[PDB]
Design an enzyme around this catalytic site. Structure first.
Site, PDB file in Angstrom:
ATOM      1  CD  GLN A  89      -2.516   1.368   2.599  1.00 39.18           C
ATOM      2  OE1 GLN A  89      -2.302   2.392   3.243  1.00 39.18           O
ATOM      3  NE2 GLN A  89      -3.288   0.388   3.049  1.00 39.18           N
TER       4      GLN A  89
ATOM      5  CD  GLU B 253      -7.071  -4.201   1.539  1.00 38.98           C
ATOM      6  OE1 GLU B 253      -6.481  -3.252   0.983  1.00 38.98           O
ATOM      7  OE2 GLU B 253      -8.286  -4.181   1.819  1.00 38.98           O
TER       8      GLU B 253
ATOM      9  CB  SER C 261       6.073   1.290   3.492  1.00 36.53           C
ATOM     10  OG  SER C 261       5.284   0.167   3.837  1.00 36.53           O
TER      11      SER C 261
ATOM     12  N   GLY D  81       3.926  -5.727   6.204  1.00 38.62           N
ATOM     13  CA  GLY D  81       3.919  -7.132   5.849  1.00 38.62           C
ATOM     14  C   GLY D  81       4.287  -7.408   4.405  1.00 38.62           C
ATOM     15  CB  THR D  82       2.413  -7.150   1.240  1.00 37.15           C
ATOM     16  OG1 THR D  82       2.725  -7.284  -0.151  1.00 37.15           O
ATOM     17  CG2 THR D  82       1.742  -5.814   1.472  1.00 37.15           C
TER      18      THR D  82
ATOM     19  CB  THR E 116       0.781   3.894  11.688  1.00 39.90           C
ATOM     20  OG1 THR E 116       1.589   3.245  10.699  1.00 39.90           O
ATOM     21  CG2 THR E 116       0.715   5.378  11.382  1.00 39.90           C
TER      22      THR E 116
ATOM     23  CG  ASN F 210       6.096   8.433   6.543  1.00 41.99           C
ATOM     24  OD1 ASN F 210       6.415   8.641   5.373  1.00 41.99           O
ATOM     25  ND2 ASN F 210       5.285   7.444   6.897  1.00 41.99           N
TER      26      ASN F 210
ATOM     27  CG  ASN G  89       2.086   9.830  -1.090  1.00 37.90           C
ATOM     28  OD1 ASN G  89       2.881   9.336  -0.293  1.00 37.90           O
ATOM     29  ND2 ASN G  89       0.772   9.699  -0.963  1.00 37.90           N
TER      30      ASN G  89
ATOM     31  CD  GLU H 115      28.237   6.570 -15.234  1.00 41.47           C
ATOM     32  OE1 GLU H 115      29.190   6.825 -14.468  1.00 41.47           O
ATOM     33  OE2 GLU H 115      28.074   5.454 -15.769  1.00 41.47           O
TER      34      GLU H 115
HETATM   35  N1  LIG Z   1       4.952   7.987   2.401  1.00 45.39           N
HETATM   36  C1  LIG Z   1       3.879   7.238   2.628  1.00 45.39           C
HETATM   37  N2  LIG Z   1       3.945   6.184   3.519  1.00 45.39           N
HETATM   38  C2  LIG Z   1       2.853   5.417   3.755  1.00 45.39           C
HETATM   39  C3  LIG Z   1       1.665   5.690   3.095  1.00 45.39           C
HETATM   40  N3  LIG Z   1       0.744   4.796   3.503  1.00 45.39           N
HETATM   41  C4  LIG Z   1       1.320   3.966   4.396  1.00 45.39           C
HETATM   42  N4  LIG Z   1       2.623   4.335   4.573  1.00 45.39           N
HETATM   43  C5  LIG Z   1       3.594   3.664   5.457  1.00 45.39           C
HETATM   44  O1  LIG Z   1       3.365   2.266   5.440  1.00 45.39           O
HETATM   45  C6  LIG Z   1       3.592   1.719   6.722  1.00 45.39           C
HETATM   46  C7  LIG Z   1       2.741   0.477   6.974  1.00 45.39           C
HETATM   47  O2  LIG Z   1       2.491  -0.256   5.795  1.00 45.39           O
HETATM   48  P1  LIG Z   1       1.036  -0.164   5.114  1.00 45.39           P
HETATM   49  O3  LIG Z   1       0.908   1.150   4.394  1.00 45.39           O
HETATM   50  O4  LIG Z   1      -0.041  -0.301   6.162  1.00 45.39           O
HETATM   51  O5  LIG Z   1       0.912  -1.333   4.014  1.00 45.39           O
HETATM   52  P2  LIG Z   1       2.079  -2.372   3.639  1.00 45.39           P
HETATM   53  O6  LIG Z   1       3.451  -1.783   3.846  1.00 45.39           O
HETATM   54  O7  LIG Z   1       1.897  -2.765   2.198  1.00 45.39           O
HETATM   55  O8  LIG Z   1       1.835  -3.660   4.571  1.00 45.39           O
HETATM   56  P3  LIG Z   1       0.384  -4.347   4.640  1.00 45.39           P
HETATM   57  O9  LIG Z   1      -0.412  -3.652   5.716  1.00 45.39           O
HETATM   58  O10 LIG Z   1       0.528  -5.807   4.988  1.00 45.39           O
HETATM   59  O11 LIG Z   1      -0.328  -4.193   3.318  1.00 45.39           O
HETATM   60  C8  LIG Z   1       3.254   2.831   7.698  1.00 45.39           C
HETATM   61  O12 LIG Z   1       4.146   2.821   8.788  1.00 45.39           O
HETATM   62  C9  LIG Z   1       3.416   4.109   6.901  1.00 45.39           C
HETATM   63  O13 LIG Z   1       4.558   4.801   7.341  1.00 45.39           O
HETATM   64  C10 LIG Z   1       1.593   6.746   2.200  1.00 45.39           C
HETATM   65  O14 LIG Z   1       0.538   6.990   1.621  1.00 45.39           O
HETATM   66  N5  LIG Z   1       2.705   7.523   1.968  1.00 45.39           N
HETATM   67 MG   LIG Z   2      -2.032  -2.896   3.487  1.00 45.96          MG
END
Ligand SMILES: Nc1nc2c(ncn2[C@@H]2O[C@H](COP(=O)(O)OP(=O)(O)OP(=O)(O)O)[C@@H](O)[C@H]2O)c(=O)[nH]1
Ligand SMILES: [Mg+2]
Ligand SMILES: Nc1nc2c(ncn2[C@@H]2O[C@H](COP(=O)(O)OP(=O)(O)OP(=O)(O)O)[C@@H](O)[C@H]2O)c(=O)[nH]1
Ligand SMILES: Nc1nc2c(ncn2[C@@H]2O[C@H](COP(=O)(O)OP(=O)(O)O)[C@@H](O)[C@H]2O)c(=O)[nH]1
Ligand SMILES: Nc1nc2c(ncn2[C@@H]2O[C@H](COP(=O)(O)OP(=O)(O)O)[C@@H](O)[C@H]2O)c(=O)[nH]1
Ligand SMILES: [Mg+2]
Lengths: 430, 47, 49, 49, 434, 431, 430
Positions: free
Chosen positions: F11, F63, F132, F136-137, F171, F198, F220, F246
């Site tokens: 995500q 998801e 990120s 998890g994923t 978070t 962040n 973003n 480079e």
């Molecule tokens: N810069 C930025 N970071 C994000 C954003 N959304 C989530 N994050 C970061 O992603 C971290 C957690 O991961 P998730 O966004 O919940 O999703 P994921 O990394 O794919 O892991 P899953 O929950 O299993 O899907 C948080 O600690 C946020 O810092 C975003 O829109 N912009």
């Molecule tokens: Mg997610």
């Protein structure tokens, strides 16, 4: 041939230089664009003394301008005849000495003088047969006295056999505007005596006095003082540029006015000067010129020659006149006032005639005299300098950048040595 | 707010002052001259 | 050589005088470039407001 | 007797601005300005149980 | 290519800065919104900075720990002039407490202020020095001012700093604890400022009442005089003159010794339009009003001591020859006497720009004016009376518990008293004859 | 004929991935439908033969809500239908699920989509991966994909744009765990890693942009601008062009040290944008300001290994050289002893673009820097300390062990961080 | 007859070559479409030196444009005069080396350079009687210094009796655009000394200084910097294309310049260069030209010629002038500055005169001087090289593409041995 370069330093020097080139160009008939529009062939025969010839036939003065503040150039450039100067010759910093001799001689002049000294070589090396250098500067300002005297040392060090002149302005207590004038003036004269072949002293006090008494104009201005000096500057080398009965270059005057090597501080004066109220009442004759020639008030210094004895005197006559009147008048003056002339040098007056007079005046005279009266000006400066130095006033600015107290004391003794030595011949008898 | 407001305020004098202070104001004698040398006046071609 | 020496005078003065315009023209258009570009922000100020 | 350096010290024009603003720079990035928005805004309230 | 940075700290500093910036904008012809009207350059480069297209930005920063005065500037007619992030405001005022503004709150603003100072100084190439304005009798004025000077000294070195302080008047006063924070601030600034000017409020009231014929002067009237003094002092940098004097030609002509850099001010002519044109206001007479003792801007009488040196500036259409005659007359006069080791004691500057008149103001339009800055031994009296006041207060330790509990140790007051006593001894031994 | 393929997993990557695509489409004038109204779009897009263009990107997630959000948004007609890979069961903040339980049945389709895109390209420069790291994923699939691509393609350059957890603002509660396990994978499989936590981006928005309530939509946009500046030299002609290859040849002294942090300048709102001139001399000063670092780190605590800054706009070669020499004069900025010169500079002609509804003011000059410094050793230490506290009492461990992961996998991951930290300490000491 | 072929490689070389051809084309009056529109008969007499005749009466330059990336090649084609070049001569790869000397000399060097020699062999055999080659490239880049130095080695082994020239741009420490500059600069010098007959060094730092100080132009750009270098390249072979009082082709310069075979690194400069606002105050004469020609500021290198001693020097003059005036200047400058000229070789300045001035001027000079002061650049480059190499920084890329660290040791010693052997003659005495 025997061409000479021009160097002006400091804010006071540039004002003298700007007016001087205006005076010479009018004499030689050079327009502000540098194109010759003269009437006679003599105006161009000896133009190589002060000018250089560039592409297109225009003439450019061989002058080098220096300073430590960029405010100086835009005023002189924007003035009349400001386009003559070659833009490549402007050399100067961005900070300024701040009326401090040490800053203009130790901490900033050293870093910059390498650049200005280069264009000095460029100008001097281009000459086929150099005659000498002339320097314009004031002894009351920092960069004028500071870098100004340091150039004197290095220029002399590379060209020992050439002749050197300095048109120096000393500060007078009657009209003083800087509290550290005694300090930097004392140090400069120490270095100046060692190197300069001829030195000439000019006072603002006398220039204000001559304007009030002879010219009788209500309000003098810096234009007037600059012009009076510039008129005398051209007279010194007039016969070098024009024919005459007895031509006399710079070297000839140096020999005939200096009895001993350390006595080379002269005071000059110009004639005739008259207010335009009485301009049509006066009669221009050779006897008339010499009466105003030796007048005490007409001297460009506050040192009164009647308080001392003349060592040697020099007169340069300009215009169409006979030799007998020139010779007989000098003899009569030397006999009517025989008390004021030192006796072991018989007939100690020199004369020279150039038959191209200044524009406007049918006849004119510049007077250069070496007299024992000038010692009193060094004394009165010394009295002020020793008064401030005993209490260590205004000193940590000079000593804060490598200078120490022994330099001040050493300058005190040598200056005191010069004055004590200079009055030795005043009372000496045969 | 009452004291400081938007005020209407509106170099020729600077130039006039600068030029005057470098000026002459007294000139010199008036010029009747014509250039001529002493060696050229006396020695002339004769018939 | 006297004429060609004078012939270099008028060529030089025109070339130097011509050089002045490029110095002035670049300055003039640079102000116009910034003037219109600054006015774009006032559009952005209103849109943000 | 002047090398390539120590010659740019001589004043040339108003173009020295492109090479002389930061000699007296009060060095650089010595201070911190991180999270100094406390003054322009109002801090979030913090609550005790 | 010459620049200067002005620092305003405290309410009084901000109030005087507003007036002086209005004066500078009027003099350089820039509208209050910053835009040049209608359509001779670099005359504004000393104080302003071009944005590259049109408007200008002053080289100033505003400081205060209370937003009551700052927010007025961001809302008034000059809201478009100053950069939004150089009007720095706090949240809690020092409340006339030097300790609060030097150990508790002032240490949270100084880092941001120095960052702003760097962001202003890196954009200038010929900075002659810093100008710092502060009222000494207040907490944040004394505290943040001292901290600012202490940090700027170590961060910059030999750059000149000019402080236009405002000492409390001899008997007229506003607060009751202001003798306390004056001593510490004086001790801090003594070894950290290069030139200091004394501008106490009581004297300016007398000058206004006597000359401008105002029977109820207000703080707005006083600030205009100080603004005019600053304009006269700094006009030689940004306007063409016959005999120019730069900022660095003060610390070579006015301070004989490093510890003696406290000096007074005088301005003339100050006159209203109702009687401005009844006299010619010649340079010969205006220079007498400059040395007139009751015209000094500080409540100190030069007749009680010697004169050390005098640097005085002219502007208008003054002629250098006319100045010399007046100086000779003053030196001839017997009532004014100088120290023996100072034969020549005058530094004179001449400028061409006449003093600009503010519409809606009080002063009239005059072709000539003179601003005089003198150094004299008479300044010893202002510290002695303040020393007596502080001793009377500190005899039985009053108001002290409001300073000890904020981080200052008990013994700090003792050291400042020794500094003041040594300073007085230094003036006495300098003023003694040989 | 130069192409780059972008991979967006999780995500965090997808939402950052979206913001990149309004900017890329806007620069080349491609409408959301994909039809233009010369061959500069070839870096990111590809001509379909007649009309529209499709991006060279693939979106990976398990998801469906975020993917279905894209498939129904205004950009439904842009992306290829079968390159939006969507799953059924989310990894749910578990690294073991996304690497041992879910990821075994996911990569096979994913590598098929990568293969189809790669064969279309002819001059493939490299890959860009967004994820990120504290999810998890995000790390579970990212570790698996990077390992698989390391053997399928070999020498191709892979650039990683990760988002590490902030020092104190977060978070999730288990993110110190899945962050450490991911490091052991991307340390030996990624050529370039970027620090994009962040918390630092929050501070820039509050201070510079005059935004009092920043949101993930705002962040973003900033990250998208950095991507454009990094790759601007591939598709726009300039005075000094720098390729993707480079970066590693100029920023990586040793293969282990490839973690750099970025900064961008200027970032000013339109309210006070042209209330100042924004000279080229001052923008390079703002880049080196420690507050403008996009990562929560202090460069003043360490030396600089190498610096690479890209200029775009109307800059000229005279002024960068004058500005760079000024930086070396500064005393607060000190470089490592064995690196006399450390600046690599590129200049481009195309000015940065402005997106409608955005916050950044339009400017004629900009600079983006990727700096390698020894000061980045702090972020590893603070996360290492957090992992030590929780693992002391084996908290949350039973969740990971039940998903096929061994008990000792944490121990070998912890040792790698200790090995990594000693490398940074060893390099920084002068000879 | 005695024609030469031009080979340019790398981004820096292509920009240098692009402006060089525009200068030559205007000199001979060749339009970008290849149609001759000159005015003088001499403009067509020796056009076969640089141009190959084609059907329809158009001329095509015999240049081999070589590189590894298409970005810079597409730019030179879209610019003016980009239609002169034959599309066949454009040879380029797809992957590029990217500042990696090993990649540009070992991996991608070997597989692509087979093609470029194929066209070079075609061009070299076609001409009547070859005179030599000339190559423009930069030592700070990978492809320019990597594949460029392998190109010279392959050509030299096939044409051992021809003249080889290279115009090299070395990376100065003041201005740096690549962090890996010391490594690829050191390796190229080792290969360059063994093969190149003449090597000329140019600095980005020196060119920036000349434009800022001498030309006094506010906006320098790579177009302007390439202009100065382009004029220098045309100057050396001017007398090969046009008649003159003293003809001296490229080979004749080699004999009179290189005393010992390993000392073939020259530093060059061009004069007169003046600002467009101050060209009306100067005078274009032989004495004035030689002062600017010998000035240390005018030189196109950061090395100070006054810090060492000149082994041999050469000056080429263009225009009409008197041979006596030129000969005395070389004699005079040698006597005035005898300290800077090594003594065991008398009369170490060579003068040549060509009577075709450049378009827009009446006189011009080109200076090529072998001075011992050039050792400064090899010292500073080695100092940077030995600093990075001690920690093995950035070294895993070179060892990762078939190279070993032993080659660095050989390169460092040979480059260091060059300095020691080159400084020996500075203090050598009779
Ligand atoms: N810069 C930025 N970071 C994000 C954003 N959304 C989530 N994050 C970061 O992603 C971290 C957690 O991961 P998730 O966004 O919940 O999703 P994921 O990394 O794919 O892991 P899953 O929950 O299993 O899907 C948080 O600690 C946020 O810092 C975003 O829109 N912009
Ligand atoms: Mg997610
Ligand atoms: N000349 C002048 N002085 C002022 C003015 N306002 C206040 N002062 C002086 O400032 C002193 C007290 O400080 P304040 O100006 O009230 O405020 P401060 O200096 O910032 O100190 P704090 O009140 O603690 O914030 C008084 O003794 C006054 O002499 C003014 O408008 N003009
Ligand atoms: N004759 C003349 N003297 C001047 C002029 N301007 C200043 N002075 C004198 O020069 C002295 C100050 O010298 P200053 O300008 O500081 O010299 P600097 O330090 O070299 O710039 C004063 O005492 C003036 O009397 C002028 O225009 N003409
Ligand atoms: N004289 C000149 N030098 C240039 C130009 N463009 C770049 N350079 C220099 O070339 C260096 C970079 O070399 P590079 O182009 O990468 O060489 P390449 O790898 O062989 O193509 C920079 O340090 C610049 O100083 C130009 O147009 N003219
Ligand atoms: Mg207050």
């Amino acid at each position: 041939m025997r061409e000479i370069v021009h160097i002006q330093g400091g804010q006071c020097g540039n004002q003298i230089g700007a007016k001087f080139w205006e005076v010479i160009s009018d004499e030689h008939g050079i327009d502000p664009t540098g194109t010759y529009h003269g009437d006679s062939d003599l105006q161009l025969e000896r133009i190589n003394v002060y000018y250089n010839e560039a592409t297109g036939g225009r003439y450019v003065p061989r002058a080098i301008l220096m300073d430590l503040e960029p405010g100086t150039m835009d005023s002189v450039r924007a003035g009349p005849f400001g386009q003559l100067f070659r833009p490549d010759n402007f050399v100067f910093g961005q900070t300024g000495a701040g009326n401090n001799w040490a800053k203009g001689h130790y901490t900033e002049g050293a870093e910059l003088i390498d650049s200005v000294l280069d264009v000095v070589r460029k100008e001097a090396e281009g000459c086929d047969c150099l005659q000498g250098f002339q320097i314009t500067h004031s002894l009351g300002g920092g960069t004028g006295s500071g870098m100004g005297t340091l150039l004197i040392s290095k220029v002399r060090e590379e060209y020992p056999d050439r002749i050197m002149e300095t048109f120096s302005v000393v500060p007078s207590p009657k009209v003083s505007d800087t509290v550290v004038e005694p300090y930097n003036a004392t140090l400069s004269v120490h270095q100046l005596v060692e190197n300069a072949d001829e030195c000439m002293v000019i006072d603002n006090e006398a220039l204000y006095d001559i304007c009030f008494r002879t010219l009788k104009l209500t309000t003098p201005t810096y234009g007037d003082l600059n012009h009076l000096v510039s008129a005398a500057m051209s007279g010194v080398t007039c016969c070098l540029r024009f024919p005459g009965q007895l031509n006399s270059d710079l070297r000839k005057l140096a020999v005939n006015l200096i009895p001993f090597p350390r006595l080379h501080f002269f005071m000059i004066g110009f004639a005739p000067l008259t207010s335009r109220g009485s301009q049509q009442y006066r009669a221009l004759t050779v006897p008339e010129l010499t009466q105003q020639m030796f007048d005490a008030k007409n001297m460009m210094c506050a040192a009164d020659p009647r308080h001392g004895r003349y060592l040697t005197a020099s007169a340069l006559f300009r215009g169409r006149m006979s030799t007998k009147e020139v010779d007989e008048q000098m003899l009569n003056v030397q006999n009517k006032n025989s008390s004021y002339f030192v006796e072991w040098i018989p007939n100690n007056i020199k004369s020279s005639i150039c038959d191209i007079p200044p524009k406007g005046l049918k006849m004119a005279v510049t007077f250069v005299g070496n007299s024992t009266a000038i010692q009193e000006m060094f004394k009165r400066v010394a009295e002020q300098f020793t008064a401030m130095f005993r209490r260590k006033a205004f000193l940590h600015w000079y000593t804060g950048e490598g200078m120490d107290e022994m330099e001040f004391t050493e300058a005190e003794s040598n200056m005191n040595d010069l004055v004590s030595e200079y009055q030795q011949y005043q009372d000496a008898t045969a | 707010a009452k004291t400081y407001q938007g005020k209407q305020m509106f170099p020729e004098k600077i130039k006039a002052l600068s030029k005057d202070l470098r000026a002459e104001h007294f000139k010199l004698g008036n010029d009747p001259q014509s250039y001529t040398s002493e060696a050229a006046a006396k020695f002339k071609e004769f018939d | 050589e006297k004429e060609q020496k004078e012939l270099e005078k008028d060529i030089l003065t025109k070339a130097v005088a011509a050089y002045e315009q490029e110095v002035e023209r670049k300055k003039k258009e640079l102000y116009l470039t910034n003037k219109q570009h600054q006015s774009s922000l006032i559009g952005q100020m209103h849109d943000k407001d | 007797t002047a090398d390539r350096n120590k010659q740019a010290k001589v004043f040339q024009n108003k173009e020295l601005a492109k090479t002389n603003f930061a000699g007296k720079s009060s060095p650089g990035p010595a201070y911190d300005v991180r999270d100094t928005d406390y003054f322009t805004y109002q801090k979030a309230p913090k609550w005790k149980i | 290519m010459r620049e200067v940075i002005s620092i305003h700290v405290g309410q009084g500093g901000i109030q005087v800065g507003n007036a002086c910036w209005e004066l500078f904008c009027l003099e350089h012809g820039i509208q209050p919104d910053g835009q040049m009207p209608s359509d001779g350059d670099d005359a504004f480069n000393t104080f302003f900075s071009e944005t590259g297209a049109g408007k200008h930005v002053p080289r100033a920063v505003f400081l205060d720990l209370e937003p009551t005065v700052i927010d007025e500037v961001r809302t008034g007619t000059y809201r478009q002039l100053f950069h939004p992030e150089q009007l720095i405001s706090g949240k809690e005022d020092a409340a006339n407490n030097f300790a609060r503004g030097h150990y508790t709150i002032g240490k949270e603003i100084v880092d941001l202020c120095l960052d702003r100072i760097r962001k202003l100084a890196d954009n200038c190439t010929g900075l002659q020095g810093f100008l710092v304005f502060n009222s000494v009798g207040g907490g944040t004025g004394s505290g943040l001012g001292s901290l600012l000077l202490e940090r700027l000294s170590v961060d910059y070195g030999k750059k000149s700093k000019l402080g236009f302080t405002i000492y409390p008047s001899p008997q007229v006063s506003t607060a009751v604890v202001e003798p306390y924070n004056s001593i510490l601030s004086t001790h801090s600034l003594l070894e950290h400022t290069d030139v200091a000017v004394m501008l106490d409020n009581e004297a300016i009231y007398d000058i206004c009442r006597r000359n401008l014929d105002i029977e109820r002067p207000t703080y707005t009237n006083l600030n205009r005089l100080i603004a005019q003094v600053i304009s006269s002092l700094t006009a030689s940098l940004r306007f063409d003159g016959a005999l120019n004097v730069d900022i660095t030609e003060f610390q070579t002509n006015l301070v004989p010794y490093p510890r003696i850099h406290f000096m007074l001010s005088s301005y003339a002519p100050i006159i209203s339009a109702e009687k401005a044109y009844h006299e010619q206001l010649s340079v010969a007479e205006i220079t007498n009003s400059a040395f007139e003792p009751a015209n000094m801007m500080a409540k100190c009488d030069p007749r009680h001591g010697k004169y050390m040196a005098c640097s005085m500036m002219y502007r208008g259409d003054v002629v250098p020859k006319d100045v010399n005659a007046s100086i000779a007359t003053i030196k001839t006069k017997r009532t004014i006497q100088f120290v023996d080791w100072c034969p020549t004691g005058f530094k004179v500057g001449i400028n061409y720009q006449p003093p600009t008149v503010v519409p809606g103001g009080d002063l009239a339009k005059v072709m000539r004016a003179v601003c005089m800055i003198s150094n004299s031994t008479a300044i010893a009296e202002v510290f002695s009376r303040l020393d007596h006041k502080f001793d009377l207060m500190y005899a039985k330790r009053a108001f002290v518990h409001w300073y000890v509990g904020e981080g200052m140790e008990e013994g700090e007051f003792s050291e400042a008293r020794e500094d003041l006593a040594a300073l007085e001894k230094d003036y006495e031994e300098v003023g003694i004859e040989t």
